[PDB]
Design a protein around this ligand. Sequence first.
Ligand SMILES: CC(=O)N[C@@H]1[C@@H](OP(=O)(O)OP(=O)(O)OC[C@H]2O[C@@H](n3ccc(=O)[nH]c3=O)[C@H](O)[C@@H]2O)O[C@H](C(=O)O)[C@@H](O)[C@@H]1NC(C)=O
Ligand SMILES: CC(=O)N[C@@H]1[C@@H](OP(=O)(O)OP(=O)(O)OC[C@H]2O[C@@H](n3ccc(=O)[nH]c3=O)[C@H](O)[C@@H]2O)O[C@H](C(=O)O)[C@@H](O)[C@@H]1NC(C)=O
Ligand SMILES: [Cl-]
Ligand code: NA
Ligand code: NA
Lengths: 363, 358
Amino acid sequence: MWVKILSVVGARPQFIKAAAVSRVLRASPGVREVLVHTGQHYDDNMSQVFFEELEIPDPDYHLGIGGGTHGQNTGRMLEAIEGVLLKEKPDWVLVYGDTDSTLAGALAAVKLHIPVAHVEAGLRSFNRRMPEEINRILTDHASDLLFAPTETAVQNLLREGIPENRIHLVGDVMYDAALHYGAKAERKSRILERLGLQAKGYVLATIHRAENTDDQERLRVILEALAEVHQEVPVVFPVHPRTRKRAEAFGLGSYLEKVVALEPVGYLDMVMLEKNARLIVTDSGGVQKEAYFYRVPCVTVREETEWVELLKAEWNYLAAPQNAKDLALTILHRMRTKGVEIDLYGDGRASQKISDFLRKVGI
Amino acid sequence: WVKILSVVGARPQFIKAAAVSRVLRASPGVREVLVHTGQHYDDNMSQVFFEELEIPDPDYHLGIGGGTHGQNTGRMLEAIEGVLLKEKPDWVLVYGDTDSTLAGALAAVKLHIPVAHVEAGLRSFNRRMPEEINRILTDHASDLLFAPTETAVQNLLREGIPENRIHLVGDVMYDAALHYGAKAERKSRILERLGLQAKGYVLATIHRAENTDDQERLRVILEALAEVHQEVPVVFPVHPRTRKRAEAFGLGSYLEKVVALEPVGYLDMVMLEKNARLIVTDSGGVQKEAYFYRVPCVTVREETEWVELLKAEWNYLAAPQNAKDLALTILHRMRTKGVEIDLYGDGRASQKISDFLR
Ligand SMILES: CC(=O)N[C@@H]1[C@@H](OP(=O)(O)OP(=O)(O)OC[C@H]2O[C@@H](n3ccc(=O)[nH]c3=O)[C@H](O)[C@@H]2O)O[C@H](C(=O)O)[C@@H](O)[C@@H]1NC(C)=O
Ligand SMILES: CC(=O)N[C@@H]1[C@@H](OP(=O)(O)OP(=O)(O)OC[C@H]2O[C@@H](n3ccc(=O)[nH]c3=O)[C@H](O)[C@@H]2O)O[C@H](C(=O)O)[C@@H](O)[C@@H]1NC(C)=O
Ligand SMILES: [Cl-]
Ligand code: NA
Ligand code: NA
């Protein structure tokens, strides 16, 4: 009954998913966990704070890979992860989400015949210019187990020819995380006090996607829209490090001063900011869902989302950044809104469902 | 004019690329760029194809190979992208199903460079085969899928890939046989060199890992071929890895018993194929080629991706479970043939491909 299960994680949102899962595997008797941190997120506010606050053991391995092209990053990680797998020889490799790390892990494993399970499988944007879209498609096609969080994702995998018996709708482990760490956030966050905000008295924003930050006019559209909204309702913005580097390089730095621009916060503070906001504006996948978790209206600053159920339930609304004036107006309009009551993403036990499937599979 | 960059790493990919190159040189507004990833690198596994099939010197040799899946693929992924960044082609073409193919496709698609897969949609339905993974992942990464067969088309549709991205163009390896057949007739002296009479010998190639990494399977095969040899000469251009495995397991004496050769160039292979009474193989290319020349084929495997060849009775599967059983199957199939049928197209697969890229 001694099974070794190795998780590959590279970034903040993967650390959070792995926490939810690791919490449950830690209670599985006879399961040894190994964690490989690939190196993409290394700053202590992007990485270690997740390990501390979320109670995750330090990574068994730090590969320290990041900062180059898709080829460099992905190719160096593929070779580096495979080296770990030949030594650790796990029974299962878990990969999470849709980064270059995810694919590099799936691909390292599948060629060694090591069973791979994709946590958060079958999400599609249908925009292959997104690197994440390639990553999750190829990942999914290389996996033995596909842990789908929604029915859309199930349907996506069936339509690409993947057999039912490898597909499991288990819900979203990020809902487990919100459920299980909520009380701890409540008890230990002092972020509202420290910023001097009260409930329903601000708007929360995050923005980090390449399409939005790698293009000067697009980024300007966003920051100027945020500064405008700030006039009517205060705007709290924990700026991703790369979003700060890009704003700076572009001369848009002045705009961050016109809002409540913070550094990245940890999960417990993030939970309290999200729970207590009037509205959340984001280009993050995870924040989209978490907005819904706390029944706070969301605007997503993208041309599409993989989380289509949120749009359909009216909790989310897309606003591509074409014009600052219009984007501000949309944000203020949507602050007045609410979606319909509905249960998405499961019961908070997606991680237990995952654990059960891993041990009782037949390897 | 439009820039079309081809990634090739192995013998069969040089052959496929030869046929495609032949069309693209003659195309009005096409510049061709060629990347050799470095996977096959002897003269008899590489250079001989460039010389004999009139393939222009590659623009880049990456010189990668000989490591694990992780090493070869990751390093190819990094190096190929470096080339794509300099060259910025309009199309990337990848071929077959090796690690080179997947690395090429994945380098390109993240840079928004349209990828087209030459030989798309083949499936063994055994995902423990590395190339099965490679061609699945490649097909889902590509923009255009050049399928050689109906089965391949159906495989691609079943996986959700839209019919507007799927072109059944036949097989560029049929192009190559057709378009370099004369040349081979003119230049090849190998039958004479080896004292062989047309249709007085059997041709064998064996290189798949499931047959060469398993000592029992390889012994079964090499004993079977030695037995067959007693009835009708067996000629065997031995893949170098296959030689190494045979020597490693102590099976070198079975190679001595047949007419074992080193790998041969394509012109010699065409001549050996044409003129063989029967072909015994685990190669994908060679089983098709057997059919091209209406020579009965035995495939030493439990399945093949080329299922039409079994259906048409030109090919027959023979798993290497027992040396004498395998030999008897081989001798039995020598005096069979399959039905009249036209597979793999008319020899203008490459022309159809060229047209679609504009
Ligand atoms: C490339 C891309 O943008 N793909 C998607 C990407 O995730 P996300 O976009 O959500 O990145 P993030 O926003 O950095 O993190 C969110 C968390 O940080 C917390 N968060 C956020 C800010 C902060 O200051 N502090 C926090 O604790 C929040 O509370 C959240 O819990 O990578 C994910 C992954 O690979 O696993 C994919 O599953 C995912 N795909 C989908 C479809 O949602
Ligand atoms: C992993 C694997 O085995 N994948 C398959 C693999 O092909 P093959 O097995 O045919 O390799 P090979 O036999 O070394 O070369 C044949 C040629 O050599 C010539 N040949 C052969 C021997 C010789 O001594 N001299 C020659 O000129 C012959 O006349 C032939 O023209 O690689 C192909 C590729 O990636 O393009 C895949 O498309 C393919 N997948 C399928 C489905 O067939
Ligand atoms: Cl690096
Ligand atoms: Na659930
Ligand atoms: Na001999």
